[PDB]
């Protein structure tokens, strides 16, 4: 189960974050021992499509090759805090698993600037018992975490040294699919 009420960034700039561009996960911290492997790659695009706040997701496990995309319409809880009812889709937006009761995530944007972000995610999916996840994002898939985002990790009373990097997984992303999924 999740245990954190993450606090959103003071002065969060939603239009800059939700600009339709891609964010790559560079580092992550899963609070429950084994909800996820020590290497999925992940990326997302977030934006407004025909007036609707949307987020598209990509996951890839470079060892198993397990791959999946999702798209969600987002609902607002407060500035920087959103609820996402996800649908599993192929890379072209064709539905594989419809929106389902019990299938949603919340996320909180704890820190963001033009190039980097720190988010909290609480995923709910069927009968899995999942815990809190934190992720450091960058607009550049190769960027080492800089001082603004690392300081934000500290300010959340977390230790960046505990975060697991995705950089040695050598993941390659279909950015075009993420951006186009925002409309689907
Ligand atoms: C970027 C922020 C992330 C968000 C919003 C997110 C969200 C989600 C969602 C919605 C699902 C279920 C998708 C579906 O069933 O259609 C999922 C599954 C999963 N995610 Fe993430 N995720 C993120 C990052 C990560 C990271 C960095 C990892 C690293 C290991 C990870 C590991 C997993 C795993 C292992 C599953 C499979 C869960 C299961 O079915 O048991 N996710 N995630
Ligand atoms: N996840």
Curated annotation (Swiss-Prot):
InterPro entries: Calycin (IPR012674), Nitrophorin (IPR023613), Nitrophorin_domain (IPR002351)
SUPFAM superfamilies for this protein: Lipocalins
Tissue specificity: Salivary gland (at protein level).
Chain positions recorded as heme binding sites: 59
Pfam name, any one: Nitrophorin
GO terms under biological process: vasodilation
EC number: 1.7.6.1
UniProt entry tagged with the keyword Metal-binding: yes
Catalytic reaction(s) noted: 3 nitrite + 2 H(+) = 2 nitric oxide + nitrate + H2O
Location in the cell: Secreted
Gene3D superfamilies per record: 2.40.128.20
Molecular function GO labels: histamine binding; metal ion binding; nitric oxide binding; oxidoreductase activity
Described function: Heme-based protein that delivers nitric oxide gas (NO) to the victim while feeding, resulting in vasodilation and inhibition of platelet aggregation. Reversibly binds nitric oxide (NO). Also binds tightly to histamine, which is released by the host to induce wound healing. NO release is pH dependent and linked to loop dynamics.
Family (UniProt): Belongs to the calycin superfamily. Nitrophorin family.
Other facts noted in the record for this chain: Superposition of the structures of NP4 in the presence of ammonia or nitrite shows a conformational change of the protein upon NO(2)(-) binding.
Protein's name in the database: Nitrophorin-4
Protein's organism: Rhodnius prolixus
